[PDB]
Amino acid sequence: QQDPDPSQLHRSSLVKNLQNIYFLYEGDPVTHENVKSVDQLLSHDLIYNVSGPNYDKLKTELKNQEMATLFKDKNVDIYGVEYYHLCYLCENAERSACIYGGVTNHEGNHLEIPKKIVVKVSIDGIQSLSFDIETNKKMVTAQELDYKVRKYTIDNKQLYTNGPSKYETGYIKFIPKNKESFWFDFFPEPEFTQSKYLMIYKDNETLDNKTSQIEVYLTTK
Amino acid sequence: QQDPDPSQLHRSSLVKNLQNIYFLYEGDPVTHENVKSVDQLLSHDLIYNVSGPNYDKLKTELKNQEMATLFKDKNVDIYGVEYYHLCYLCENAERSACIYGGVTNHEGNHLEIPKKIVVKVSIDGIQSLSFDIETNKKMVTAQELDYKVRKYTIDNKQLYTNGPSKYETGYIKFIPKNKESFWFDFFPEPEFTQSKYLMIYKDNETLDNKTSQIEVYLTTK
Amino acid sequence: QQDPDPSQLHRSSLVKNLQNIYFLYEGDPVTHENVKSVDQLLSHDLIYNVSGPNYDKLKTELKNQEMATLFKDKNVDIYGVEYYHLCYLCENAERSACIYGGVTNHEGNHLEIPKKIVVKVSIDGIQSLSFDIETNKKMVTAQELDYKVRKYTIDNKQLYTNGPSKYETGYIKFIPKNKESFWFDFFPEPEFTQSKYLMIYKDNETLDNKTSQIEVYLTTK
Amino acid sequence: QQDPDPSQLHRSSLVKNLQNIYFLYEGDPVTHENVKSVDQLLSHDLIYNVSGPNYDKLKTELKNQEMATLFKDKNVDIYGVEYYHLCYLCENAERSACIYGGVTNHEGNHLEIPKKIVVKVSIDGIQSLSFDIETNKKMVTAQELDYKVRKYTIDNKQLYTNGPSKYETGYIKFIPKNKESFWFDFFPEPEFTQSKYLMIYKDNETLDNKTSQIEVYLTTK
Known part of the structure; x- marks a missing residue:
């Protein structure tokens, strides 16, 4: 490009x-130092149980399958712009938030x-x-x-x-x-x-x- | 009852x-002194172009067609508990807010x-x-x-x-x-x-x- | 009334x-003889694992919590009008189908x-x-x-x-x-x-x- | 690739x-010989007032703004796979139906x-x-x-x-x-x-x- x-x-x-x-x-971004995913909706997105002003859960659609799984079991650092209108998570979750990428390893x-x-x-x-x-x-x-x-x-x-x-x-x-x-x-x-x-x-x-x-x-x- | x-x-x-x-x-309730609906989605709900921290529009589902149409052309005071998860408005509306009833005339x-x-x-x-x-x-x-x-x-x-x-x-x-x-x-x-x-x-x-x-x-x- | x-x-x-x-x-209504609920979303609705041309799953919002539970473990006969626009079931379920009530016992x-x-x-x-x-x-x-x-x-x-x-x-x-x-x-x-x-x-x-x-x-x- | x-x-x-x-x-794809878009939701999709067994309206997310707009005012032939779960259109349109691409000029x-x-x-x-x-x-x-x-x-x-x-x-x-x-x-x-x-x-x-x-x-x- x-x-x-x-x-x-x-x-x-x-x-x-x-x-x-x-x-x-x-509005302030979403930030979370050293954490780990818990559930995940589609093979290419991850969920985190972090809280914030307007949220008790958080998903991050990554590039694709391969990437998602890579950070599934890694303590990471998230920094992303969230959106609310049209955000999905657990069939049972109100107070959801959404972001894309913005995930980077923590240690080292x-x-x-x-x-x-x-x-x-x-x-x-x-x-x-x-x-x-x-x-x-x-x-x-x-x-x-x-x-x-x-x-x-x-x-x-x-x-x-x-x-x-x-x-x-x-x-x-x-x-x-x-x-x-x-x-x-x-x-x-x-x-x-x-x-x-x-x-x-x-x-x-x-x-x-x-x-x-x-x-x-x-x-x- | x-x-x-x-x-x-x-x-x-x-x-x-x-x-x-x-x-x-x-969290704080939704308050709005003396206003008038503008657009309306269903014959039994009205919309108010108000502002709040987390919303620039607002819907209120009332009992039925009758009541709704009743307060449509009337200046009113609104006071109500708002929810966000599962709230609809204009096809082009992000930052929506809803409530049920909570509407009362303003004058007198x-x-x-x-x-x-x-x-x-x-x-x-x-x-x-x-x-x-x-x-x-x-x-x-x-x-x-x-x-x-x-x-x-x-x-x-x-x-x-x-x-x-x-x-x-x-x-x-x-x-x-x-x-x-x-x-x-x-x-x-x-x-x-x-x-x-x-x-x-x-x-x-x-x-x-x-x-x-x-x-x-x-x-x- | x-x-x-x-x-x-x-x-x-x-x-x-x-x-x-x-x-x-x-179009044809929804019919299913003798069955049993399986999962359920809200305390007042039941989900049935049945199929029809446009669905592999079916939910039925009943009167109240009480009524729901009542049919949760009963073989019933469903008969009702379904709708698709605005129907929710399993966070993972596409091809859903909803209906209201229309549940009647089966035996005797x-x-x-x-x-x-x-x-x-x-x-x-x-x-x-x-x-x-x-x-x-x-x-x-x-x-x-x-x-x-x-x-x-x-x-x-x-x-x-x-x-x-x-x-x-x-x-x-x-x-x-x-x-x-x-x-x-x-x-x-x-x-x-x-x-x-x-x-x-x-x-x-x-x-x-x-x-x-x-x-x-x-x-x- | x-x-x-x-x-x-x-x-x-x-x-x-x-x-x-x-x-x-x-199940049968979606076909439409010689037609023209009417409305459009996002700058990168178009809508057609076409009819099928399960739809009275149809949207088609294309590559981008340029493309869409290109086919905006042209007589086209639609050929494509439609999906229903999670298809959006007019704030007032139930019986929607979506598809990606599948649009080609008609004449010549x-x-x-x-x-x-x-x-x-x-x-x-x-x-x-x-x-x-x-x-x-x-x-x-x-x-x-x-x-x-x-x-x-x-x-x-x-x-x-x-x-x-x-x-x-x-x-x-x-x-x-x-x-x-x-x-x-x-x-x-x-x-x-x-x-x-x-x-x-x-x-x-x-x-x-x-x-x-x-x-x-x-x-x-």
Whole structure:
């Protein structure tokens, strides 16, 4: 996957209920240090018995079968954007939550001092600014970063607002010291659902913090 | 309806996930002063475009077609226990919230000084204690009360808990100065869902605060 | 419950997607002789491991907890109208099928020769005609009948169609030789769901064939 | 996508409720000659006001926004596998029915005489046999075929059955005269749902019949 063309980017203005994206990145993420799955619905998703403000259970649809089973019996670290509307678990569970990927091993992956990272932002071609974000994981979830990144630009540069966004088009780009570059369109298809958009974290992509970079691009358009 | 029999009272011990009742009466209720429905799904429910922490829309299932259509063009005050698991609205609605009944006119039904009402608590026959609860409405949603009443006992006499309850059988009894008397088992069937239990507030029973009395009967068993 | 008033009746002209009612009574009902529940979802419903063209599982929401348990270990004869839109069973079960009540014991309740019952139809004050319906059960589900009855009038007097109905109002009245009389409105509220209408059979009302009578009242209007 | 490895194939023995696959392929597919979409839920799916025995409406999730929109205003021919458990449409549509892909232009793409295509079957390495399948389309959905192929083997070589499979591993492979080859795993992961599986049809892959070939590999294992 190479750098996107200006004709592939979803434009905010078009998206219907866009606020439903706001809440995703404005509200705190789900975080759980060292845990282990318990039940699982489909051979490609895992469940965890963790609690939170709005949940007493949690599922995470991973890339596929092979991946799911791999973390079935491993103490992991979860960091994901959850969604509620259209989330399923135990035939008997109200107070469910859902996420995709965001799962990374625990032992031998949690650092000493948080390796901050520089996120370069480009508004209309010109590099207006840059900021920092932290992490603990030597190997972090693509997701994690994106959030922390967005969360910021959402509280300081009003990326998403309970309503129209200040930017027409925006995408986040990752640069692993050795792998290919990739990106996520900050905006959904005109008509979307939380569940459907959040599949951008399903591949549960992971990359070394120490060696990866991050570039953001937006259009004041 | 007349006073129950100790064999018709649901017993807490039996109830599975009982906490799902807890969260209902522990967390803040749904309040909305003077509003008017907008769209409506079924001829017996109305929708209100209100806002809350976890919702931007709201549905309320009432007794039937008649009643619904009755409050459609009327400004009203809403006060009700909301559930989330199994709540529907607009095909394009994420962040939904529901409730049963809990609707009362607004104009000419709001007092000056909150009329305080005394509830007589009886633990195992003996009238252990009594407490107060307020309102504003001349004609109150049976619901409202029930809530306020449970909320208290819960935070003070540990009615419901995030887990097993201290009590086994308990029910609230209302007594209208000229109407019959009725009650609501404080405990759902062994296997229930929020949406199903809360239906007790469907008839949207209303009564005059000035003349009506309340009694609660619990069992330490 | 006494005979209705011409203002309490629903009007087929109002009903939106009326066809959804057609099908219900057009297509074959659900029949299963001598069986036993297996699993159960909510304290007040039972699941049967039976099959039909479009289902390998079947749930039946009964009146209350009490009633449910009562048939949990009894060989019964099911006979009822099923619906698929909005039916829940096993977290893993696709091809579900739900119905309300329609459960009657099996042993010592089935006859030799079917007792034909006469239904008196009335179109606009005048008793235009009457026909016969069969059954085997000494004690039958209020349901069973109503179907057989409707079914008929639909293939012969086109009660329901894939669209507008020839009639505007109509209801079926049952007359137990000793109990009270009661009825069902042939037309739902203007905006309904199969699930929500079919509950008229939840009480699982049963009556003796030998002694009961049926009368229908329609309007050409 | 090159030929799979014997470790990448899902094994029926494992698969849970497997029958659910049977049904999809045992009962008639969904066909519609020359039609046009009307409404649409997500920017990447379309809806058609078509009628079948179990549906008065039909949705079809395609590859993405672009594709959908492309076929939005065109007379198309639908050919595809429909699943019901978990199919969504209009907030007011019961009797829904979904499918992925299976959409192809209509005008100029339909033939005179059905070009029969030969499929090569290989049971345990040996090509025990081969058979023919028809079609009208100059360009066919990968789907159509896969179905007809399976449907066949299913009534003649007991591929699937209302239960365990006579085979353990099987996949259909397609071969374009100028494009890359690919395949579909005849079996779902151990725990699946119709919805999820049928997705292998989402890319709405299409290809010229006159030049394409079909192979099938299974194992009696």
